Paper text:
UdgX excises uracil from uracil-containing DNA to concurrently form a covalent bond with the resulting AP-DNA. Structurally, UdgX is highly similar to family-4 UDGs (F4-UDGs). However, UdgX is unique in possessing a flexible R-loop (105KRRIH109). Our earlier studies allowed us to propose a reaction mechanism of UdgX, which involves the formation of a covalent bond between H109 of UdgX with the C1′ position of the target deoxyribose sugar concurrently with the uracil excision from this site in DNA.
It possesses α/β/α fold with four central parallel β stranded sheet sandwiched between the α helices. The functionally important elements such as motif A, motif B, and the R-Loop sequences of MsmUdgX, and the conserved sequence 90TNAV93 found in UDGs are shown in Figures 1A and B. UdgX follows a unimolecular substitution (SN1) reaction mechanism, wherein the glycosidic bond between uracil and the deoxyribose sugar in the DNA is replaced by a unique His-deoxyribose sugar covalent bond (1.5 Å) in UdgX–DNA upon excision of uracil. Briefly, as a first step in the reaction, uracilate anion formation is facilitated by hydrogen bonding of H178 and N91 with the uracil in the active site pocket, resulting in a ‘pulling’ force on uracil and weakening of the glycosidic bond. In the next step, E52 (motif A) activates the H109 (R-Loop), converting it into an efficient nucleophile to facilitate its covalent bonding with C1′ (having a positive charge imparted upon it by departure of uracilate anion) of the target deoxyribose sugar. Q53 makes hydrogen bonds with the O of K110 (2.87 Å) and N of K97 (2.82 Å). These interactions remain intact in the DNA bound form with bond distances of 2.69 and 2.79 Å, respectively. Thus, these interactions may help anchor the R-loop towards the active site of UdgX. Our studies suggest a major role of H109 in carrying out the unique role of UdgX in forming a covalent bond appears to be facilitated by its ability in avoiding a water molecule in this location, whose activation by E52 would otherwise result in the release of the AP-DNA, as in other UDGs.
Author numbering: 2 to 207
The structure:
Amino acid sequence: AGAQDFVPHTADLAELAAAAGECRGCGLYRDATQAVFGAGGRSARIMMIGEQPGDKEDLAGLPFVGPAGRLLDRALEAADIDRDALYVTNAVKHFKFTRAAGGKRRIHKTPSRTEVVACRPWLIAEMTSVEPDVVVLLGATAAKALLGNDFRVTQHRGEVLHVDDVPGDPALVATVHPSSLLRGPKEERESAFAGLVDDLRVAADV
Ligand SMILES: O=c1cc[nH]c(=O)[nH]1
Ligand code: SF4
């Protein structure tokens, strides 16, 4: 059942976000500071979904406000997409993490498929509330949430996909997670950034 009994019968994003603050659909709510719901409005035509809030998001209450968010903002700007017009959220709403000794931050840990499926009712409610024309899946966890646990982002870059069990049958575009472009060889990061821009443009051109 997961988060299902915690999701209210409302499409109002403010009411949904407040209810998510109360969610116990999996165990992640316990150590996290708060739930991080999506940001944006129901008029948005483009919904973007990441994996989970990170250290900064857990305390800001907003998605994509750390380094990965800054890289995403650079990609959106290059793609001529206004972040204010998007609805941005994550597959899981509570930060899953650990700390390492000497660490400079809390380290995100990958949600289990079990936690993703537990939290999915929130994603469904968000999609029902926003009725996006296109959904950008940033990274493996988000893409698998809607396209299946076996889905490989690397094999379907910037392809326009459509599956039958998604609300409103929006177009789906799976792409690299912005966090992946933060580190690595310069030429590899630059090529990967260009591909993210391409994928965002495909989505915006739906
Ligand atoms: O909101 C956020 C921030 C970092 N990484 C994610 O997947 N989502
Ligand atoms: S991660 Fe999702 S399902 Fe789990 S407690 Fe948080 S909001 Fe509920």
